[PDB]
Design a protein around this ligand. Structure first.
Ligand SMILES: *[C@@H]1O[C@H](CO)[C@@H](O[C@@H]2O[C@H](CO)[C@@H](O[C@@H]3O[C@H](CO[C@H]4O[C@H](CO)[C@@H](O)[C@H](O)[C@@H]4O)[C@@H](O)[C@H](O[C@H]4O[C@H](CO)[C@@H](O)[C@H](O)[C@@H]4O)[C@@H]3O)[C@H](O)[C@H]2NC(C)=O)[C@H](O)[C@H]1NC(C)=O
Ligand SMILES: *[C@@H]1O[C@H](CO)[C@@H](O[C@@H]2O[C@H](CO)[C@@H](O[C@@H]3O[C@H](CO[C@H]4O[C@H](CO)[C@@H](O)[C@H](O)[C@@H]4O)[C@@H](O)[C@H](O[C@H]4O[C@H](CO)[C@@H](O)[C@H](O)[C@@H]4O)[C@@H]3O)[C@H](O)[C@H]2NC(C)=O)[C@H](O)[C@H]1NC(C)=O
Ligand SMILES: *[C@@H]1O[C@H](CO)[C@@H](O[C@@H]2O[C@H](CO)[C@@H](O[C@@H]3O[C@H](CO[C@H]4O[C@H](CO)[C@@H](O)[C@H](O)[C@@H]4O)[C@@H](O)[C@H](O[C@H]4O[C@H](CO)[C@@H](O)[C@H](O)[C@@H]4O)[C@@H]3O)[C@H](O)[C@H]2NC(C)=O)[C@H](O)[C@H]1NC(C)=O
Ligand SMILES: *[C@@H]1O[C@H](CO)[C@@H](O[C@@H]2O[C@H](CO)[C@@H](O[C@@H]3O[C@H](CO)[C@@H](O)[C@H](O)[C@@H]3O)[C@H](O)[C@H]2NC(C)=O)[C@H](O)[C@H]1NC(C)=O
Ligand SMILES: *[C@@H]1O[C@H](CO)[C@@H](O[C@@H]2O[C@H](CO)[C@@H](O[C@@H]3O[C@H](CO)[C@@H](O)[C@H](O)[C@@H]3O)[C@H](O)[C@H]2NC(C)=O)[C@H](O)[C@H]1NC(C)=O
Ligand SMILES: *[C@@H]1O[C@H](CO)[C@@H](O[C@@H]2O[C@H](CO)[C@@H](O)[C@H](O)[C@H]2NC(C)=O)[C@H](O)[C@H]1NC(C)=O
Ligand SMILES: *[C@@H]1O[C@H](CO)[C@@H](O[C@@H]2O[C@H](CO)[C@@H](O)[C@H](O)[C@H]2NC(C)=O)[C@H](O)[C@H]1NC(C)=O
Ligand SMILES: *[C@@H]1O[C@H](CO)[C@@H](O)[C@H](O)[C@H]1NC(C)=O
Ligand SMILES: *[C@@H]1O[C@H](CO)[C@@H](O)[C@H](O)[C@H]1NC(C)=O
Ligand SMILES: *[C@H]1O[C@H](CO)[C@H](O)[C@H](O)[C@H]1NC(C)=O
Ligand SMILES: *[C@H]1O[C@H](CO)[C@H](O)[C@H](O)[C@H]1NC(C)=O
Ligand SMILES: *[C@H]1O[C@H](CO)[C@H](O)[C@H](O)[C@H]1NC(C)=O
Ligand SMILES: *[C@H]1O[C@H](CO)[C@H](O)[C@H](O)[C@H]1NC(C)=O
Ligand SMILES: *[C@H]1O[C@H](CO)[C@H](O)[C@H](O)[C@H]1NC(C)=O
Ligand SMILES: [Ca+2]
Ligand SMILES: [Ca+2]
Ligand SMILES: [Ca+2]
Ligand SMILES: [Ca+2]
Ligand SMILES: [Ca+2]
Ligand SMILES: [Ca+2]
Ligand SMILES: [Ca+2]
Ligand SMILES: [Ca+2]
Ligand SMILES: [Ca+2]
Ligand SMILES: [Ca+2]
Ligand SMILES: [Ca+2]
Ligand SMILES: [Ca+2]
Ligand SMILES: [Ca+2]
Ligand SMILES: [Ca+2]
Ligand SMILES: [Ca+2]
Ligand SMILES: [Ca+2]
Ligand SMILES: [Ca+2]
Ligand SMILES: [Ca+2]
Ligand SMILES: [Ca+2]
Ligand SMILES: [Ca+2]
Lengths: 361, 5, 1077
């Protein structure tokens, strides 16, 4: 069964769609916007989620990453966060993660740009920074090598391009209000979905931009979308409720959760959503960045930097070493986590459970 | 006032 | 040698008709060489080849009207004659000792000084002017608890409180009082007197100021009988059929008494000069065009069409008897219509106008609009130089005057010292000088075009009554042909002054109907003065002596600040509409708005070689031999030497001798060029030309540029020198030798202990100089207030405008003499000031409806919903106030009810501004300057990826810092990068002077900063604990902790530990150990 992720202004709550009960997660945070996850990149059993934050006044926004258990449940684990070191963010309304490679995509709304870098945010470089007013959420389709982004200002538009910033195009520009969330149906011929905070409708269209359809209407101000199995997810911003409906728009609107208005997004935590089986087309020939494109790949340099003269691979910018990740608490099946003098996450097994990290028993 | 540079 | 563009050689006649140059000797030769005969003009030299009247009895006084009265009743206190003949001073009612009970009753004014035979002296009652009879030889008394209690005066009834009457003898019963508004029966005089309507225009001054009998109500025009009816004698609008019709109805037959034959067929009656109009019942003389009806109503006088009305012809007018001729000035071509003049030089004009942050290049027609310079601080006034193609300006945010060629190269500051608030400037292109005005020192200066040889040439007041003084000087123009300097002033007594260019012959030009004269200029062809007023809203021109004013625009101008004239069009800068406009220079027709501006445009100039006419330099090639300033004498006919601001002018028989006299705290240059302040000495900046400013025996400098250095190495601001406060550790700023000959500027007054204070605080009842010299009675008595300021008996000085202010200024009410203030001598300035309804205060008119009680009785703020706002340049608030349109959407609540800020659409940023995240504009130089300027550091965002300004150094963290701050020995970058990469300063490999501690990241701090508990230098070398293992700290207050750190003071007993083990919050020191039980 898929796991639901719901980030609030102060805390992040995960809800099981089958167990129908909540569980403890990261706490003691302020002004976060959106989350995204990567399915256990190290194949250990802890997936990595990327939650971005914004700040008020003097302090700037930032992006942080944290671990999440992949097993049935986990509690009392002291989840520790780490700041990516990405400075100069006002409000990251859009954020997405690419599992094919180690790149992260996020658009700073006030900076009217779309920023990419490594998973630890070292080789920052702007994709496109022109003809934007209010860059909304970002979606990525690595299989077809196409990203998606929208603007919700005086010129509401939905646009797609390659992951290296070229071949920019606009999908539709008519009968659009205030787009807020984007979603791609990875199984239905890469069909894309989006919402509207003004028209209060959810519409679908193909990746190339043909056969625009009105799926559902009167959704009570949807904010973000998520498609899993054969159903569509959305959250009413002004009320905080979560609803489900058939992705073909031929079913009643079911009710699941009622949450406070601080709720910002609904995201499904499942491996089948992203299909990690896709291989990496990169040949590891690029010096700093290896972005994706349909039918191949390309090399990129950090922002404001140029390649060495005569060459199109090596960048003049310096190369910095990656950043390690602190170990998580892998205590399983109702275990507890403890830190010794070495500060290693040494678990404390409960009654009837033995072994390292308390598996089985 | 209304006349200060 | 070539003729200057469009003109002719210094010896060559130029034909007005077509501009070609004709030989000089061909002028007035009897042959019309020029194409229109302009070389044989009118001014060319010719060729020769009781018992009697009023006397009833010698013992009876004779009244002036013929009446007879007894002579023993003269000067008894009552007007027995009825025409004041018996009480007339000229009838010897003065200069005599009034005898016995008939006291003199000492007073100035005659009517209340009458020597009444008072037998009730000392009874306890006020009996004449000042009631001194109760003080001649009298006794004290104690007040009854019911009546009013005059302190100086007698204890009199409560009806005397606030009744327009002096009862205590010193108006103490009227001090602090108010007045209920006069009723319908009582007309309110301008000074606050309630007078019954029986006395209005009764030919008697009842109010005391003559307001009741002013001509506004005492005209009463007589009937006119317009056409279709006929007037005979006094207003009889009888039918024209009643003209000479033998019926005496026209008063005493006014038309039958004449109506004879034509009286102008002969000189026996009419004697009219030019023409005759004999008509019904009478005749009248009249004159041909070109002649004015003279005041004698008999003859004709030739009109001076040039001086009386310069509007008739464009550039220069020559009067002729009964007509006029207008010639164009050298360099202009006269159009075939005979009036219009066209510029002949092929150089085309273009406006240079001084926007905030920019110097702009605007073409006259409005087609082009470019930038000359950008990124300036705040340019309030500029002026050009034609000879070297330079461009001088003021920068009020930096207090400097710069210069630069017109091709944008060789920018250079020429003045940076002792310039408080420079308001305007002009360039003396003839004798190479620079004139400027400052509002704080309130003076007119002069300097060499290069900055050297500054001098003061006008201060204090301008006139022989100190009625007009430098208060807020602004705007200045030059007339080097006549050697004059003109400058405006918008103080309380707003005026336009004039002076020669060496300080002599200062005078007032315009002093009436002038409130806010922001601008001034001269049309060099007409020799016509020009100015504009921001309050009354006009643009007036006049002759150079101030006579014959005329109005271009009448009250339709929102707010001009700087005007300029080329050919026949005048360009001005308007603050309220934030526009540069243009129109005809006489009537204002053809008004065109050249350009909009996001910031108020301050100055403007037509750049053209004709705007600075070429004329011979008097000091040419020699400076007249003067080693110092060679100024132009008034009248433009000779020169005159001078000396700088701190030299003594001594005259020999044939050569002026200026020698230095500068103070102890001033340094005199080796070749005696000038004197510079002592703190300027020994700083590496070669302030002096000859190099004596920086000797090789100079001690090492620790302080930054501009800071005085104490002998032991400490630093302080320059104002701390000789201020009677020990501001250095050893007090080298208080050394006796530094103060022995201390001096300070004209606007501050020196005390006994050599600390000098502002002149307004002198004798202010508060001890400022610490020695009570400013409040010493001996000096506070003998001293004279500076010109233009009224002096109190208390010793205080006040601006003269504060006499009759109603509010107390001197504390002793010496500034409110009611008797003087209640007459006509202190009326309000008509049609420029607003008069209150109860009090006698006169307030400036623009203070009406401004959100403040100006008239002290809310009269100025009453009925505010009826005053109309300006039709073009005003914004109307919800509370019916009017504000300048420039203050709408500016971001500040100005109306008082946020009317301006409601529905405010954010403005656009200019060429040199950056739009903040929340839609706000800030200077581009504020981007990444190590400070939060956009409210939320959104300017500091993402600048690892941009270069800085050309003159700024960039830290590794992306912030921009001034280059001069690099490698100075002090941490200025956030990461101290500005010192981390640059070499040593000394040959022995040491970084900074040994008198300071050295941190490992090459920034040096003072010795005491070591282990101070704060990361003073970013590397933290000072906070290393091993340093203060060998360094003690101040044991009584500096808590030497267990591990030998010396956490102290405010961070003791705090919420967190600074020593590391919590001893600085331990309940052993904060808790009272003994606390002296
Ligand atoms: C931006 O615009 C400015 C102003 O036009 C230019 O500055 C001028 O540049 C010229 C060319 O370099 C300068 O001309 C040279 O001036 C020298 C100094 O002369 C002084 O005395 C004379 C006479 O009173 C003054 O007119 C002058 O202002 C100086 O005070 C001369 O010694 C030079 O003589 C040499 O050339 C001449 C021919 O021109 C020969 O006859 C001589 O034998 C000798 O070889 C020369 O005349 C001029 O002085 C500059 N202006 C000023 C006021 O200094 C900038 O060049 C221009 N910049 C750019 C980049 O466009
Ligand atoms: C800026 O102003 C500050 C004060 O705010 C000055 O601080 C003084 O600095 C001097 C040194 O420059 C200190 O003098 C030292 O005094 C020690 C004994 O203290 C007595 O005498 C001093 C006056 O000299 C009195 O102030 C004090 O109250 C005591 O009465 C001496 O032991 C020190 O000797 C040093 O040099 C000798 C000879 O090489 C060595 O043998 C010693 O080991 C030692 O290194 C020294 O003379 C003075 O105490 C400080 N006063 C205060 C109140 O702080 C700064 O000096 C000044 N700026 C700079 C950079 O000079
Ligand atoms: C590398 O080189 C620098 C110099 O470039 C060294 O710094 C010098 O250190 C010496 C020794 O401390 C200093 O000499 C002493 O200066 C005292 C203060 O006078 C200075 O400051 C005053 C301020 O008014 C100036 O007027 C004056 O000109 C000086 O600049 C003097 O009082 C000392 O005199 C006393 O000792 C001498 C003997 O040394 C006796 O003959 C005297 O009678 C008296 O008792 C003395 O002159 C010198 O000032 C420092 N110079 C600077 C600029 O720092 C570094 O120490 C050195 N570093 C290393 C580690 O190599
Ligand atoms: C008002 O008075 C003026 C001045 O006296 C009168 O001007 C006169 O006008 C007449 C007609 O133009 C002039 O006569 C002419 O003189 C010339 C030259 O001699 C001659 O060639 C013509 O044939 C004609 O006779 C007369 O000279 C002139 N007077 C002067 C002194 O210039 C005017 O007529 C009077 N107008 C009224 C309404 O009274
Ligand atoms: C203010 O703006 C005006 C108009 O834009 C500027 O006038 C321009 O001045 C330059 C420099 O003199 C002219 O270039 C020169 O033209 C002459 C004659 O053709 C030629 O001999 C030179 O070799 C050079 O090309 C330019 O033509 C002229 N443009 C106009 C329309 O007048 C003026 O310079 C500006 N002033 C400042 C301080 O920026
Ligand atoms: C300068 O001040 C003198 C007074 O010292 C003025 O003279 C007085 O003028 C007023 C009218 O303005 C008269 O009422 C006084 O009678 C005059 N007194 C004397 C003694 O002269 C003088 O008019 C002032 N200057 C100017 C040009 O107004
Ligand atoms: C000093 O100033 C006075 C005016 O205050 C000048 O006097 C005027 O001078 C002009 C031109 O000579 C005359 O036409 C006026 O009639 C004068 N008016 C008065 C009231 O004096 C005087 O010329 C100036 N002196 C100098 C040195 O220029
Ligand atoms: C100044 O702004 C107003 C309003 O936008 C506009 O009508 C006017 O044309 C502008 N000025 C000029 C000379 O273009
Ligand atoms: C005074 O002001 C009135 C207008 O209120 C004006 O008509 C008159 O000309 C002015 N001059 C004087 C002193 O009467
Ligand atoms: C001729 O003289 C005039 C006046 O001094 C100008 O300097 C002009 O530039 C000169 N012409 C040439 C060609 O030098
Ligand atoms: C002109 O010439 C005559 C003689 O024909 C006289 O000398 C007369 O004085 C001269 N006029 C002047 C102004 O010199
Ligand atoms: C007051 O007047 C005297 C002359 O009587 C001096 O000019 C003195 O300088 C004046 N007062 C001041 C403060 O300058
Ligand atoms: C770097 O940035 C500054 C500020 O924006 C200026 O634009 C400057 O011209 C730039 N420098 C370069 C070499 O492009
Ligand atoms: C630092 O500069 C001084 C200047 O006199 C000397 O050149 C010294 O040798 C320099 N130090 C080094 C390490 O080069
Ligand atoms: Ca001739
Ligand atoms: Ca009498
Ligand atoms: Ca008495
Ligand atoms: Ca009274
Ligand atoms: Ca009267
Ligand atoms: Ca009649
Ligand atoms: Ca005439
Ligand atoms: Ca002033
Ligand atoms: Ca006034
Ligand atoms: Ca106005
Ligand atoms: Ca110096
Ligand atoms: Ca001091
Ligand atoms: Ca005082
Ligand atoms: Ca007063
Ligand atoms: Ca008011
Ligand atoms: Ca406002
Ligand atoms: Ca800043
Ligand atoms: Ca520095
Ligand atoms: Ca320290
Ligand atoms: Ca502490």
């Amino acid at each position: 069964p898929p796991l639901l992720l719901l980030p609030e202004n102060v805390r992040i709550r995960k809800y099981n769609t089958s167990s129908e009960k909540f569980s403890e997660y990261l706490e003691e945070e302020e002004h976060i916007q959106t989350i995204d996850y990567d399915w256990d990149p190290e194949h250990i059993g802890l997936s990595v989620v990327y939650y971005t934050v914004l700040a008020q006044g003097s302090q700037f926004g930032a992006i942080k990453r944290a671990y999440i258990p992949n097993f049935e449940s986990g509690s009392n684990n002291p989840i520790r966060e780490v700041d990516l070191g990405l400075k100069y963010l006002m409000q990251p309304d859009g954020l997405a993660v690419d599992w094919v490679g180690r790149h992260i995509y996020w658009s700073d709304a006030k900076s009217q740009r779309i920023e990419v870098a490594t998973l630890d945010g070292r080789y920052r470089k702007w994709l496109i920074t022109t003809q934007l007013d209010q860059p909304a959420a970002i979606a990525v389709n690595p299989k077809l090598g196409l990203m998606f982004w929208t603007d919700q200002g005086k010129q509401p538009k939905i646009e797609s391009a390659w992951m290296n910033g070229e071949h920019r195009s606009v999908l539709v520009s008519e009968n659009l209000g205030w787009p807020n969330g984007l979603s791609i149906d990875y199984l239905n011929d890469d069909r894309v979905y989006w919402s509207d905070s003004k028209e209060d409708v959810i519409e679908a269209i193909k990746y190339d931009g043909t056969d625009r359809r009105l799926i559902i209407n009167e959704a009570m101000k949807p904010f973000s979308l998520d498609i899993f199995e054969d159903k569509l997810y959305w959250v009413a911003k002004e009320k905080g409720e979560v609803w489900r409906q058939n992705k073909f728009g031929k079913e009643n609107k079911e009710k699941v959760l009622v949450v406070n208005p601080w709720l910002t997004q609904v995201r499904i935590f499942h491996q089948l959503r992203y299909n990690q089986s896709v291989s990496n087309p990169c040949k590891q020939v690029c010096s700093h960045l290896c972005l994706l494109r349909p039918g191949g790949y390309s090399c990129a340099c950090p922002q404001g930097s140029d390649f060495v003269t005569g060459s199109t691979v090596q960048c003049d910018a310096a190369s910095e070493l990656p950043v390690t990740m602190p170990p998580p608490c892998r205590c399983m099946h109702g275990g507890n986590c403890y830190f010794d003098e070495n500060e290693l996450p040494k678990c404390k097994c409960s009654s009837g459970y033995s072994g390292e990290y308390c598996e089985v028993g | 006032x209304x006349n200060x540079x």
